[PDB]
Amino acid sequence: MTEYKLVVVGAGGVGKSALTIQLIQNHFVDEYDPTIEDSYRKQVVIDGETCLLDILDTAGQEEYSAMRDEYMRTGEGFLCVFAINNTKSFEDIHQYREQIKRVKDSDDVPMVLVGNKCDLAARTVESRQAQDLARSYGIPYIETSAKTRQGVEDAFYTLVREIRQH
Ligand SMILES: Nc1nc2c(ncn2[C@@H]2O[C@H](COP(=O)(O)OP(=O)(O)NP(=O)(O)O)[C@@H](O)[C@H]2O)c(=O)[nH]1
Ligand SMILES: [Ca+2]
Ligand SMILES: [Ca+2]
Ligand SMILES: [Ca+2]
Ligand SMILES: [Mg+2]
Ligand SMILES: [Mg+2]
Incomplete structure (x- = not known):
């Protein structure tokens, strides 16, 4: 089968682990335990292809x-x-994209911009603002909630579909 290596990055507390655990294990992590570096593996069928993520x-x-x-x-x-309720985390995205470019030594790395916690109402990043940022990078923007599962599969599968275009 085909293997895709996906990396989830972003500011502390934005929900990287909760998103990943929702995708892989189908439950929501309510507590906040900061991550060092963790790996997960799952065989999934994405668009009719058996994938190892x-x-x-x-x-x-x-x-x-x-x-x-x-x-x-x-x-x-x-x-x-x-x-979406953490303006600083959105501003921080620029620096994560720069780090990605640096470590891959490439200007066109497969990426998806994810606005998480979309179940919460203290929104300070409006959809259009994030759409604009993603457009400037030439990548999709998708909103997610690790809590409700909204957009979670879509975000990860979209990333696989982006890898397939490169
Ligand atoms: N309401 C809501 N809370 C969320 C969502 N995603 C994460 N959280 C909450 O936000 C906190 C941090 O989540 P976590 O996944 O640990 O964040 P992280 O980005 O992995 N943190 P770190 O970078 O330190 O490892 C947790 O209390 C978690 O329940 C979401 O979509 N909605
Ligand atoms: Ca829980
Ligand atoms: Ca480098
Ligand atoms: Ca692109
Ligand atoms: Mg984490
Ligand atoms: Mg504003």
Whole structure:
């Protein structure tokens, strides 16, 4: 089968782990345990193709971010995650994209911009603002909620479909 190595990056607390665990294990992690570097593997059929997904869940907390660049280096596609109720996390996306470019030594790496926590109403990043950022990078924007499952499969499968175009 075909293997896709996906890496999930973004600021601390935006929901990278909750998204990944919802996809892989079908439950919502309510507590906040900061991640160092975790890996998940799942065989899934995506558009009629049996896929092996290797998903790297990375640290967003600066204190835990040692060697994150060495993990990111291995990725074939990246979910760049911010939270729609965390303006700073959205502003931080620029720096994650720059890090991705640096570690892949490429200007056109498969990526999807993900606005997570879309179940929450304290929105400070409007959809149009994120759409514009994604457009500037030439990538899709998708909103998700790790809590309700909204958009979760769509985000990860869209990333696979982006890898397939490159
Ligand atoms: N309402 C809501 N809460 C969410 C959502 N995603 C994550 N959370 C909550 O936000 C907190 C942080 O989630 P977590 O997945 O640990 O974030 P992270 O990006 O992996 N953090 P780190 O970078 O430190 O590893 C948790 O309390 C989690 O339940 C979401 O879509 N909706
Ligand atoms: Ca739970
Ligand atoms: Ca480099
Ligand atoms: Ca593109
Ligand atoms: Mg985490
Ligand atoms: Mg505003």
